Design a protein around this ligand. Sequence first.
Ligand code: FAD
Length: 296
Amino acid sequence: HSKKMEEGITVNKFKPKTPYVGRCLLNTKITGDDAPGETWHMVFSHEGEIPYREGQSVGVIPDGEDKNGKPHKLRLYSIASSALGDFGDAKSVSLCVKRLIYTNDAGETIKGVCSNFLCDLKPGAEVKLTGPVGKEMLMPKDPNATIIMLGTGTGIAPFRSFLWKMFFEKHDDYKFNGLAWLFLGVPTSSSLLYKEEFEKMKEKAPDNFRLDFAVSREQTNEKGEKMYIQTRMAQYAVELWEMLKKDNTYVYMCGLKGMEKGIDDIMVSLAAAEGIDWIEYKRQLKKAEQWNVEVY
Ligand SMILES: Cc1cc2nc3c(=O)[nH]c(=O)nc-3n(C[C@H](O)[C@H](O)[C@H](O)COP(=O)(O)OP(=O)(O)OC[C@H]3O[C@@H](n4cnc5c(N)ncnc54)[C@H](O)[C@@H]3O)c2cc1C
């Protein structure tokens, strides 16, 4: 029994030993110059060979060899385009990639392998893909579901996937009529990803879509606290709490591993005020497919 759209999904049609070789169509930097670190939206051609669904991931094998002459290990990326894709023909796949740069123990700058390879791609370059992978983050079957989406940074990718399908496409068997509520936490305004597409979706389905941003370094709450995602959520504590108690409410969380703790921290308090132990309630939601997590 699934409450999610699990029927007929494809998984691992392509594998690390026999990846699908697609080509880069476009690669654009989607963060502003201010932004701490860059994020790029890149689109690849797959000619219909990767039949993915919204919520899934692909694996990427960056070109080159590891320190032992073997091929690099794959890295996973949530797909950021809906199943029809950014061109609406089902033949392309899009990624949202943050370029990883750090400094090691000796103070030397180190570029992360797959992220820099991807962010550096030029239209026409080839890229090795595996997958599709994943079941955790598939959409609910119920077209009148209340869907709450909590993302940080690149974790916006699967919710973009969802939202294109819900609001930018016409489907013969699916018409969303519920309430979708996205919270997106980023550090700067220059780090807001796809804001312009979400603003058009809001205009289109004002009654079906709610939108909240948490820009940590630029926003504060009354106490004067930094606006983190849990910080912005708390401002709607009563409402969210109420939503969580309904059977047709589904929560999805995606992004940096850290976000999980601060959210559990708000929730623990909301629940206890009600005589509810968050740890057990959360476990029951996870079991009923209502609390869906992918952090990395
Ligand atoms: C399910 C899934 C979905 C994902 N979705 C996406 C997505 O949509 N977009 C995206 O950008 N990424 C996403 N990722 C992350 C992605 O898979 C890669 O891990 C990321 O792009 C970096 O890999 P890389 O090859 O560039 O880095 P690597 O060359 O693998 O470098 C990684 C290593 O960097 C080290 N490191 C990182 N920061 C520091 C620091 N400050 N100090 C010291 N060491 C450091 C850690 O030791 C780590 O093991 C996802 C991961 C998973 C599991």
